[PDB]
Design a protein around this ligand. Structure first.
Ligand SMILES: COc1cc2sc(C(=O)CCC(=O)O)cc2cc1OCCCOc1cc2sc(C(=O)CCC(=O)O)cc2cc1OC
Lengths: 174, 177
């Protein structure tokens, strides 16, 4: 139930607010500059081990930062012009650019990791994998009822390895 | 359980990352961006915790005595693959009988809106009548976590309430310091 609430909050508090505006941001980026073009959809990394690093090129050198997408702003809960920033990455395969996409980790998975570390959270490391799977499954179930959000994102769940090959397999499915 | 996880995530995923850098941003605003003739913006993030889980996006709509003054200088950090993820926060003037009674950084705890949404959607398996108990649990859990994070606890103030003057609610907390 910790993961059930986290998935509902990740959707209500974030995905619901950025995914309807994402297509236009990507088109605007591609207009100023097929595979050369940044692919559509937010690619969401879901490591079931709940390991969320801040730098992607550290996780896999074949994932290289290209540019920041133009930021989205909106008045949110008293924050005037709350800023939504997203990053574009190149995916390399044997020294060649094989794909370009908007990529990030689902940050609530780091909450599961931290809760399993802190005694006061009353959350055991033995329950973390089941909770990570439930977070992913709940997010999939919600997105199945939100067509605008579902078509604007791709869920990349995995257990450990090549992170770029994991992303490319999803990118090549289209 | 839903609210227990939401409070832990609001701390781990947000407060833990902005509260250690807040003091410096307020001091910078006061030294270089604040109107020369104005009083200093108070320290600490004032977090609104409406137990009814009603989270509007515009504060002057909730109470006309809460007026937007300026945005604090933004904080940036590489976060989970987002290069220079931006943290923006807003400064408000609190009016009492037409005049300035206080100036502070203010916002709603957005996870409370998740409780409201879940109580509405059938697929969330969260009964309409469960909202208040979960809102109270969110606030209590957040208070418990902050009691173990010294810097963070000193960089924020929790404003929990049931409905009314929202500006008077904030001023009572501002004046306690
Ligand atoms: C209100 O609920 C959420 C809001 C956001 S905003 C967000 C991002 O902007 C993605 C990048 C990041 O985590 O910095 C993720 C989430 C997840 C949310 O739900 C997960 C459960 C609650 O935990 C968090 C609460 C907040 S509140 C927050 C804010 O930026 C405050 C203003 C706002 O919500 O727009 C970030 C988080 C991040 C959280 O977990 C990662």
């Amino acid at each position: 139930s910790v993961a059930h609430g986290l998935a509902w909050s990740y959707y209500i508090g974030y995905l619901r607010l950025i995914l309807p505006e994402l297509q236009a941001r990507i088109r605007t980026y591609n207009q100023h500059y097929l595979r050369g073009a940044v692919s559509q959809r937010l690619y969401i990394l879901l490591p079931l081990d709940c390991g969320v690093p801040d730098n992607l090129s550290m996780a896999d050198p074949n994932i290289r930062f290209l540019d920041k997408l133009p930021q989205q702003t909106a008045d949110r809960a008293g924050i005037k012009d709350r800023v939504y920033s997203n990053s574009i990455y190149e995916l390399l395969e044997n020294g060649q650019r094989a794909g370009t996409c908007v990529l990030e980790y689902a940050t609530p998975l780091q909450t599961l990791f931290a809760m399993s570390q802190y005694s006061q959270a009353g959350f055991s490391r033995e329950d973390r994998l089941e909770q990570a799977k439930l977070f992913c499954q709940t997010l999939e179930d919600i997105l199945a009822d939100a067509p605008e959000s579902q078509n604007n994102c791709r869920l990349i769940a995995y257990q450990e390895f090549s992170l770029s090959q994991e992303v490319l397999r999803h990118l090549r499915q289209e």
